[PDB]
Coordinates of all heavy atoms in Angstrom, one line a residue:
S1 N 0.8 -1.2 0.0 CA 0.0 -0.1 0.0 C 0.8 1.2 0.0 O 0.6 2.2 0.8 CB -0.9 -0.1 1.2 OG -0.2 0.5 2.4
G2 N 1.9 1.3 -0.7 CA 2.8 2.4 -0.9 C 4.1 2.2 -0.3 O 4.3 2.2 1.0
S3 N 5.2 1.8 -1.1 CA 6.5 1.5 -0.6 C 7.2 2.7 -0.1 O 6.7 3.9 -0.4 CB 7.3 0.7 -1.7 OG 8.3 0.1 -1.2
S4 N 8.4 2.6 0.4 CA 9.2 3.7 0.9 C 10.6 3.7 0.2 O 10.9 4.8 -0.3 CB 9.4 3.6 2.4 OG 10.1 2.5 2.8
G5 N 11.2 2.6 0.1 CA 12.5 2.6 -0.6 C 12.3 2.6 -2.0 O 11.3 2.3 -2.6
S6 N 13.5 2.8 -2.7 CA 13.5 2.8 -4.2 C 14.3 1.7 -4.8 O 15.4 1.5 -4.5 CB 14.1 4.2 -4.7 OG 13.2 5.3 -4.4
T7 N 13.6 0.8 -5.6 CA 14.2 -0.3 -6.2 C 15.3 0.2 -7.3 O 15.1 0.9 -8.3 CB 13.2 -1.2 -7.0 OG1 12.2 -1.5 -6.1 CG2 13.8 -2.4 -7.4
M8 N 16.6 -0.3 -7.1 CA 17.7 0.1 -8.0 C 18.3 -1.2 -8.5 O 18.5 -2.2 -7.8 CB 18.6 0.9 -7.3 CG 18.1 2.2 -6.6 SD 19.3 3.3 -6.0 CE 19.6 4.2 -7.6
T9 N 18.8 -1.2 -9.8 CA 19.4 -2.4 -10.4 C 20.8 -2.1 -10.5 O 21.3 -1.0 -11.0 CB 18.8 -2.6 -11.8 OG1 17.3 -2.9 -11.6 CG2 19.5 -3.8 -12.4
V10 N 21.7 -3.0 -10.0 CA 23.2 -3.0 -10.1 C 23.6 -2.8 -11.6 O 23.4 -3.6 -12.4 CB 23.9 -4.1 -9.5 CG1 25.3 -4.0 -9.5 CG2 23.4 -4.4 -8.0
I11 N 24.2 -1.6 -11.8 CA 24.7 -1.4 -13.2 C 26.1 -1.9 -13.4 O 26.6 -2.2 -14.5 CB 24.6 0.1 -13.6 CG1 25.3 0.9 -12.4 CG2 23.2 0.6 -13.7 CD1 25.7 2.3 -12.8
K12 N 26.9 -2.0 -12.3 CA 28.2 -2.5 -12.4 C 28.5 -3.4 -11.1 O 27.9 -3.3 -10.1 CB 29.2 -1.3 -12.3 CG 29.0 -0.3 -13.5 CD 29.7 1.0 -13.2 CE 29.0 1.9 -12.2 NZ 29.9 3.0 -11.7
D13 N 29.4 -4.4 -11.3 CA 29.8 -5.3 -10.3 C 30.3 -4.5 -9.1 O 30.8 -3.5 -9.2 CB 30.8 -6.2 -10.8 CG 31.1 -7.4 -9.9 OD1 30.1 -8.0 -9.4 OD2 32.2 -7.7 -9.6
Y14 N 30.2 -5.2 -7.9 CA 30.8 -4.6 -6.7 C 31.0 -5.7 -5.6 O 30.6 -6.8 -5.7 CB 29.7 -3.7 -6.1 CG 30.1 -3.3 -4.7 CD1 30.8 -2.1 -4.5 CD2 29.6 -4.0 -3.5 CE1 31.2 -1.7 -3.1 CE2 29.9 -3.6 -2.3 CZ 30.8 -2.4 -2.1 OH 31.0 -2.0 -0.8
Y15 N 31.9 -5.4 -4.7 CA 32.3 -6.4 -3.7 C 32.2 -5.8 -2.3 O 32.4 -4.6 -2.0 CB 33.9 -6.8 -3.9 CG 34.3 -6.8 -5.4 CD1 35.2 -6.0 -5.9 CD2 33.8 -7.8 -6.2 CE1 35.6 -6.0 -7.3 CE2 34.1 -7.8 -7.5 CZ 35.0 -7.0 -8.0 OH 35.4 -7.0 -9.4
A16 N 31.8 -6.6 -1.3 CA 31.6 -6.2 0.0 C 32.9 -6.0 0.8 O 33.5 -7.0 1.2 CB 30.7 -7.2 0.7
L17 N 33.3 -4.7 1.0 CA 34.5 -4.6 1.7 C 34.5 -4.7 3.3 O 35.4 -5.1 3.8 CB 35.1 -3.1 1.4 CG 36.0 -2.9 0.1 CD1 35.1 -3.0 -1.1 CD2 36.5 -1.5 0.2
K18 N 33.2 -4.5 3.7 CA 33.0 -4.7 5.0 C 32.1 -5.8 5.3 O 31.6 -6.6 4.4 CB 32.2 -3.5 5.7 CG 33.1 -2.2 5.5 CD 34.0 -2.0 6.6 CE 35.4 -2.5 6.4 NZ 36.0 -3.0 7.7
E19 N 31.8 -6.2 6.5 CA 30.9 -7.4 7.0 C 29.5 -7.2 6.6 O 28.7 -8.1 6.1 CB 31.1 -7.7 8.4 CG 30.9 -6.6 9.3 CD 30.9 -6.9 10.7 OE1 30.5 -8.0 11.2 OE2 31.5 -6.1 11.6
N20 N 29.2 -5.9 6.8 CA 27.7 -5.6 6.5 C 27.5 -5.4 5.0 O 26.4 -5.8 4.6 CB 27.4 -4.2 7.2 CG 28.4 -3.1 6.8 OD1 29.2 -3.3 5.9 ND2 28.2 -1.9 7.4
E21 N 28.5 -5.0 4.3 CA 28.4 -4.9 2.9 C 28.2 -6.3 2.2 O 28.7 -7.3 2.7 CB 29.5 -4.2 2.3 CG 29.7 -2.8 2.7 CD 31.1 -2.4 2.6 OE1 31.9 -2.8 1.8 OE2 31.5 -1.4 3.4
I22 N 27.4 -6.4 1.1 CA 27.3 -7.6 0.3 C 27.8 -7.5 -1.1 O 27.8 -6.5 -1.7 CB 25.8 -8.0 0.4 CG1 24.9 -7.0 -0.5 CG2 25.2 -8.1 1.8 CD1 23.5 -7.5 -0.7
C23 N 28.1 -8.7 -1.6 CA 28.6 -8.8 -3.0 C 27.5 -8.8 -4.0 O 26.4 -9.4 -3.8 CB 29.4 -10.0 -3.2 SG 30.9 -10.1 -2.3
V24 N 27.7 -7.9 -5.0 CA 26.7 -7.8 -6.1 C 27.2 -7.7 -7.5 O 28.5 -7.5 -7.6 CB 25.8 -6.7 -5.9 CG1 25.0 -6.7 -4.6 CG2 26.6 -5.4 -5.9
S25 N 26.4 -8.1 -8.5 CA 26.9 -8.0 -9.9 C 26.0 -7.2 -10.8 O 24.8 -6.9 -10.4 CB 27.0 -9.4 -10.4 OG 28.1 -9.5 -11.4
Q26 N 26.5 -6.8 -11.9 CA 25.6 -6.0 -12.9 C 24.4 -6.8 -13.3 O 24.5 -7.7 -14.0 CB 26.4 -5.6 -14.1 CG 25.6 -5.3 -15.2 CD 26.5 -4.8 -16.4 OE1 27.7 -4.9 -16.5 NE2 25.8 -4.1 -17.5
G27 N 23.2 -6.3 -12.8 CA 22.1 -7.1 -13.1 C 21.1 -7.3 -12.0 O 19.9 -7.3 -12.1
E28 N 21.7 -7.4 -10.8 CA 20.9 -7.7 -9.6 C 20.1 -6.6 -9.3 O 20.4 -5.4 -9.5 CB 21.9 -8.0 -8.4 CG 22.4 -9.5 -8.4 CD 22.8 -10.0 -7.1 OE1 23.8 -9.6 -6.5 OE2 22.0 -10.7 -6.5
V29 N 18.9 -6.8 -8.6 CA 18.0 -5.7 -8.2 C 17.8 -5.7 -6.7 O 17.4 -6.7 -6.1 CB 16.6 -6.0 -8.9 CG1 15.7 -4.8 -8.6 CG2 16.8 -6.1 -10.3
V30 N 18.1 -4.6 -6.1 CA 18.0 -4.4 -4.6 C 17.1 -3.2 -4.3 O 16.7 -2.5 -5.2 CB 19.3 -4.3 -4.0 CG1 20.2 -5.5 -4.0 CG2 20.1 -3.1 -4.7
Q31 N 16.7 -3.1 -3.0 CA 15.9 -1.9 -2.6 C 16.6 -1.1 -1.6 O 17.1 -1.6 -0.5 CB 14.7 -2.5 -2.0 CG 13.6 -2.7 -3.1 CD 13.7 -4.1 -3.7 OE1 14.7 -4.7 -3.7 NE2 12.6 -4.6 -4.4
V32 N 16.9 0.2 -1.9 CA 17.5 1.2 -0.9 C 16.7 1.4 0.3 O 15.5 1.4 0.3 CB 17.7 2.5 -1.7 CG1 18.4 3.4 -0.7 CG2 18.6 2.3 -2.8
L33 N 17.3 1.5 1.4 CA 16.7 1.7 2.7 C 17.1 2.9 3.4 O 16.4 3.7 3.9 CB 17.0 0.6 3.6 CG 16.4 -0.9 3.2 CD1 16.9 -1.9 4.3 CD2 14.9 -0.8 3.0
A34 N 18.4 3.3 3.1 CA 19.0 4.6 3.7 C 20.5 4.7 3.2 O 21.0 3.9 2.5 CB 18.9 4.5 5.2
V35 N 21.0 5.9 3.6 CA 22.4 6.2 3.2 C 23.3 6.4 4.5 O 22.8 6.6 5.5 CB 22.5 7.5 2.3 CG1 23.9 8.0 2.2 CG2 21.7 7.3 1.0
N36 N 24.6 6.2 4.2 CA 25.6 6.2 5.3 C 26.6 7.3 5.0 O 26.7 7.8 3.9 CB 26.2 4.8 5.6 CG 27.5 5.0 6.4 OD1 27.3 5.6 7.5 ND2 28.6 4.4 6.0
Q37 N 27.3 7.7 6.1 CA 28.3 8.7 6.0 C 29.5 8.3 5.0 O 30.2 9.1 4.6 CB 28.8 9.1 7.3 CG 29.7 8.2 8.0 CD 31.0 8.1 7.5 OE1 31.7 9.1 7.2 NE2 31.7 6.8 7.5
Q38 N 29.5 7.0 4.8 CA 30.5 6.5 3.9 C 30.1 6.4 2.5 O 30.6 5.7 1.7 CB 30.9 5.0 4.4 CG 32.4 4.6 4.1 CD 32.7 3.3 4.6 OE1 32.4 3.0 5.8 NE2 33.4 2.6 3.8
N39 N 29.1 7.3 2.2 CA 28.6 7.3 0.7 C 28.0 6.0 0.4 O 28.1 5.6 -0.9 CB 29.8 7.7 -0.2 CG 29.2 8.3 -1.5 OD1 28.1 8.5 -1.6 ND2 30.1 8.6 -2.4
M40 N 27.5 5.2 1.4 CA 26.9 4.0 1.1 C 25.3 4.0 1.2 O 24.8 5.0 1.7 CB 27.4 2.9 2.0 CG 28.8 2.7 1.9 SD 29.2 1.9 0.3 CE 29.1 0.2 0.6
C41 N 24.7 3.1 0.5 CA 23.2 3.0 0.6 C 22.7 1.5 1.0 O 22.9 0.7 0.3 CB 22.7 3.3 -0.9 SG 22.9 4.9 -1.4

């Protein structure tokens, strides 16, 4: 009944540098929840 986050599709591959971060590849679809001071989403 009305989402809050915005669905974004990975345009480029990426790797989880931290424990909280997760690995993703160009094509995967995730949903943003918030942003961090480390320029993360």
Side-chain angles (χ1 to χ4, degrees):
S1 77
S3 198
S4 63
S6 289
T7 308
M8 308 190 80
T9 302
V10 183
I11 53 166
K12 301 166 284 166
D13 187 50
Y14 170 90
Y15 324 115
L17 271 70
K18 303 270 91 210
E19 53 176 323
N20 53 5
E21 297 156 26
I22 66 169
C23 294
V24 300
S25 210
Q26 159 177 15
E28 282 210 280
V29 186
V30 291
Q31 274 82 343
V32 177
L33 298 180
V35 170
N36 169 46
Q37 68 83 32
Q38 204 174 320
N39 202 8
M40 294 298 272
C41 289

